[PDB]
Short mmCIF file of all heavy atoms in Angstrom, two decimals:
data_model
loop_
_atom_site.label_atom_id
_atom_site.label_comp_id
_atom_site.label_asym_id
_atom_site.label_seq_id
_atom_site.Cartn_x
_atom_site.Cartn_y
_atom_site.Cartn_z
N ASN A 247 -3.31 4.79 3.97
CA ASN A 247 -3.36 5.58 2.78
C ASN A 247 -2.02 5.59 2.09
O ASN A 247 -0.94 5.72 2.69
CB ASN A 247 -3.75 7.07 3.00
CG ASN A 247 -5.30 7.13 3.12
OD1 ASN A 247 -5.72 7.31 4.28
ND2 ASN A 247 -6.09 7.02 2.02
N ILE A 248 -2.13 5.30 0.75
CA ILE A 248 -0.94 5.27 -0.12
C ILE A 248 -1.21 6.20 -1.29
O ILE A 248 -2.32 6.04 -1.89
CB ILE A 248 -0.64 3.82 -0.66
CG1 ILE A 248 -0.33 2.87 0.49
CG2 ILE A 248 0.54 3.90 -1.71
CD1 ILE A 248 -0.42 1.37 0.20
N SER A 249 -0.31 7.02 -1.67
CA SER A 249 -0.50 7.85 -2.83
C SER A 249 0.80 7.90 -3.65
O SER A 249 1.86 7.63 -3.06
CB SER A 249 -0.85 9.29 -2.30
OG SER A 249 -1.21 9.98 -3.50
N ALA A 250 0.59 8.11 -4.92
CA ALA A 250 1.82 8.11 -5.81
C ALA A 250 1.80 9.37 -6.65
O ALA A 250 0.73 9.85 -7.05
CB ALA A 250 1.74 6.88 -6.71
N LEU A 251 2.97 10.01 -6.90
CA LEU A 251 3.13 11.18 -7.72
C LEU A 251 4.23 10.70 -8.70
O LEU A 251 5.42 11.03 -8.57
CB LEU A 251 3.64 12.48 -6.99
CG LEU A 251 2.59 13.28 -6.21
CD1 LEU A 251 2.28 12.58 -4.94
CD2 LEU A 251 3.27 14.63 -5.82
N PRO A 252 3.75 9.95 -9.70
CA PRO A 252 4.75 9.33 -10.60
C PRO A 252 5.36 10.32 -11.58
O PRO A 252 6.35 9.91 -12.19
CB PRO A 252 3.95 8.25 -11.39
CG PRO A 252 2.52 8.67 -11.19
CD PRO A 252 2.41 9.52 -9.91
N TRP A 253 4.86 11.49 -11.72
CA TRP A 253 5.33 12.49 -12.66
C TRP A 253 6.49 13.31 -12.22
O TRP A 253 7.05 14.11 -13.10
CB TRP A 253 4.12 13.48 -12.96
CG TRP A 253 2.80 12.80 -13.13
CD1 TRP A 253 2.28 12.12 -14.17
CD2 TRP A 253 1.82 12.67 -12.09
NE1 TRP A 253 1.05 11.60 -13.88
CE2 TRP A 253 0.71 11.89 -12.59
CE3 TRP A 253 1.77 13.12 -10.75
CZ2 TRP A 253 -0.40 11.60 -11.85
CZ3 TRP A 253 0.62 12.79 -10.00
CH2 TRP A 253 -0.42 12.06 -10.55
N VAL A 254 6.94 13.36 -11.01
CA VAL A 254 8.02 14.15 -10.55
C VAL A 254 8.75 13.46 -9.38
O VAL A 254 8.17 12.77 -8.61
CB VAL A 254 7.51 15.57 -10.18
CG1 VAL A 254 6.67 15.56 -8.87
CG2 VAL A 254 8.62 16.62 -9.99
N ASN A 255 10.07 13.69 -9.34
CA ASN A 255 10.84 13.16 -8.24
C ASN A 255 10.82 14.24 -7.13
O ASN A 255 10.75 15.49 -7.46
CB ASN A 255 12.29 12.97 -8.74
CG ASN A 255 13.22 12.43 -7.77
OD1 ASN A 255 13.95 13.27 -7.16
ND2 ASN A 255 13.21 11.10 -7.43
N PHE A 256 10.86 13.89 -5.92
CA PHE A 256 10.92 14.88 -4.78
C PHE A 256 11.87 14.30 -3.81
O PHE A 256 12.06 13.07 -3.72
CB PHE A 256 9.50 15.24 -4.19
CG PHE A 256 8.73 14.15 -3.58
CD1 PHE A 256 9.14 13.38 -2.49
CD2 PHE A 256 7.43 13.86 -4.12
CE1 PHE A 256 8.34 12.38 -1.91
CE2 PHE A 256 6.62 12.93 -3.51
CZ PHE A 256 7.06 12.09 -2.43
N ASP A 257 12.41 15.17 -2.96
CA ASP A 257 13.25 14.77 -1.85
C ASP A 257 12.46 14.92 -0.54
O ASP A 257 12.88 14.33 0.46
CB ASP A 257 14.52 15.68 -1.75
CG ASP A 257 15.31 15.51 -3.03
OD1 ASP A 257 15.77 14.38 -3.22
OD2 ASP A 257 15.29 16.42 -3.95
N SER A 258 11.32 15.65 -0.62
CA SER A 258 10.49 15.78 0.57
C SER A 258 9.09 15.97 0.18
O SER A 258 8.78 16.56 -0.88
CB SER A 258 10.99 16.98 1.50
OG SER A 258 10.31 18.16 1.07
N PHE A 259 8.17 15.52 1.10
CA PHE A 259 6.77 15.78 0.89
C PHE A 259 6.16 15.89 2.28
O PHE A 259 6.51 15.02 3.16
CB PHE A 259 6.16 14.45 0.15
CG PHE A 259 4.71 14.67 -0.15
CD1 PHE A 259 4.27 15.38 -1.33
CD2 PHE A 259 3.74 14.20 0.80
CE1 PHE A 259 2.87 15.59 -1.63
CE2 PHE A 259 2.37 14.46 0.52
CZ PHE A 259 1.98 15.16 -0.65
N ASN A 260 5.27 16.85 2.53
CA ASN A 260 4.59 16.86 3.88
C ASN A 260 3.21 17.30 3.63
O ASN A 260 3.02 18.27 2.85
CB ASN A 260 5.41 17.90 4.76
CG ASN A 260 4.80 18.07 6.10
OD1 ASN A 260 4.04 19.02 6.43
ND2 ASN A 260 4.84 17.05 6.96
N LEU A 261 2.27 16.75 4.44
CA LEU A 261 0.83 17.15 4.35
C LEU A 261 0.60 18.16 5.54
O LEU A 261 0.90 17.67 6.62
CB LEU A 261 -0.12 15.97 4.51
CG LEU A 261 -0.22 15.26 3.15
CD1 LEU A 261 -0.62 13.78 3.47
CD2 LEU A 261 -1.32 15.94 2.32
N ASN A 262 0.09 19.34 5.23
CA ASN A 262 -0.25 20.33 6.32
C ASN A 262 -1.80 20.14 6.41
O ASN A 262 -2.60 20.51 5.55
CB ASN A 262 0.15 21.64 5.78
CG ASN A 262 1.66 21.74 5.64
OD1 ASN A 262 2.17 22.13 4.53
ND2 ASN A 262 2.44 21.48 6.69
N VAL A 263 -2.21 19.49 7.51
CA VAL A 263 -3.61 19.17 7.80
C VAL A 263 -4.16 20.06 8.90
O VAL A 263 -3.46 20.06 10.00
CB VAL A 263 -3.79 17.66 8.17
CG1 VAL A 263 -5.18 17.29 8.51
CG2 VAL A 263 -3.26 16.73 7.08
N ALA A 264 -5.24 20.76 8.71
CA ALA A 264 -5.79 21.66 9.65
C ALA A 264 -6.26 20.96 10.89
O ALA A 264 -6.13 21.58 11.98
CB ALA A 264 -6.86 22.52 9.03
N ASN A 265 -6.72 19.75 10.89
CA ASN A 265 -7.09 18.98 12.09
C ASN A 265 -6.76 17.47 11.91
O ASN A 265 -7.31 16.81 11.00
CB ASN A 265 -8.65 19.23 12.27
N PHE A 266 -5.93 16.94 12.79
CA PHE A 266 -5.61 15.45 12.61
C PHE A 266 -5.90 14.75 13.96
O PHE A 266 -5.30 13.66 14.30
CB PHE A 266 -4.16 15.24 12.18
CG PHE A 266 -3.13 15.98 13.02
CD1 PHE A 266 -2.55 15.40 14.11
CD2 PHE A 266 -2.70 17.25 12.66
CE1 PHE A 266 -1.64 16.01 14.95
CE2 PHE A 266 -1.73 17.95 13.46
CZ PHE A 266 -1.21 17.33 14.55
N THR A 267 -6.76 15.40 14.80
CA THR A 267 -7.04 14.73 16.05
C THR A 267 -7.29 13.25 16.00
O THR A 267 -8.28 12.81 15.30
CB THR A 267 -8.25 15.48 16.73
OG1 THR A 267 -7.82 16.86 16.70
CG2 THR A 267 -8.64 14.97 18.12
N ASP A 268 -6.64 12.34 16.69
CA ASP A 268 -6.86 10.94 16.86
C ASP A 268 -6.90 10.15 15.55
O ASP A 268 -7.45 9.09 15.46
CB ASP A 268 -8.18 10.54 17.66
CG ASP A 268 -7.97 10.95 19.12
OD1 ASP A 268 -6.87 11.33 19.55
OD2 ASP A 268 -8.92 10.92 19.91
N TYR A 269 -6.20 10.70 14.54
CA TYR A 269 -6.19 9.97 13.22
C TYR A 269 -4.78 9.34 13.20
O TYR A 269 -3.77 10.02 13.07
CB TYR A 269 -6.33 10.88 12.01
CG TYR A 269 -6.37 10.08 10.74
CD1 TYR A 269 -7.43 9.19 10.48
CD2 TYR A 269 -5.27 10.10 9.90
CE1 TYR A 269 -7.41 8.38 9.23
CE2 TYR A 269 -5.23 9.37 8.70
CZ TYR A 269 -6.29 8.56 8.44
OH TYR A 269 -6.27 7.81 7.24
N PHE A 270 -4.86 8.00 13.41
CA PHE A 270 -3.57 7.25 13.56
C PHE A 270 -3.09 6.42 12.34
O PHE A 270 -2.01 5.85 12.48
CB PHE A 270 -3.71 6.39 14.85
CG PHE A 270 -3.96 7.08 16.11
CD1 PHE A 270 -4.59 6.34 17.14
CD2 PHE A 270 -3.56 8.44 16.39
CE1 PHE A 270 -4.84 6.94 18.40
CE2 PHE A 270 -3.81 9.04 17.61
CZ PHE A 270 -4.43 8.31 18.61
N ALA A 271 -3.84 6.38 11.30
CA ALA A 271 -3.38 5.55 10.17
C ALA A 271 -2.26 6.33 9.46
O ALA A 271 -2.33 7.55 9.21
CB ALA A 271 -4.57 5.31 9.21
N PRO A 272 -1.19 5.59 9.14
CA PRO A 272 -0.04 6.19 8.47
C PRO A 272 -0.46 6.59 7.05
O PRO A 272 -1.37 6.09 6.40
CB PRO A 272 1.02 5.08 8.42
CG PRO A 272 0.30 3.81 8.65
CD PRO A 272 -1.02 4.15 9.36
N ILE A 273 0.25 7.61 6.59
CA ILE A 273 0.00 8.19 5.22
C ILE A 273 1.32 7.97 4.48
O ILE A 273 2.34 8.43 5.02
CB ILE A 273 -0.41 9.68 5.25
CG1 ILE A 273 -1.70 9.78 6.12
CG2 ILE A 273 -0.68 10.16 3.80
CD1 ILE A 273 -1.93 11.30 6.58
#
């Protein structure tokens, strides 16, 4: 998975996922 936020610069980004069991594809 690739995503872009072209409208703002950030120094950090983190996804808070309620369940990520066995999900190994990089984000």
Side-chain angles (χ1 to χ4, degrees), residues 247-264 266-273:
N247 279 105
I248 296 162
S249 188
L251 285 72
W253 319 279
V254 70
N255 180 262
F256 59 62
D257 299 294
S258 89
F259 181 85
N260 177 259
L261 278 154
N262 297 125
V263 177
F266 50 90
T267 310
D268 294 351
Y269 184 67
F270 301 154
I273 304 161

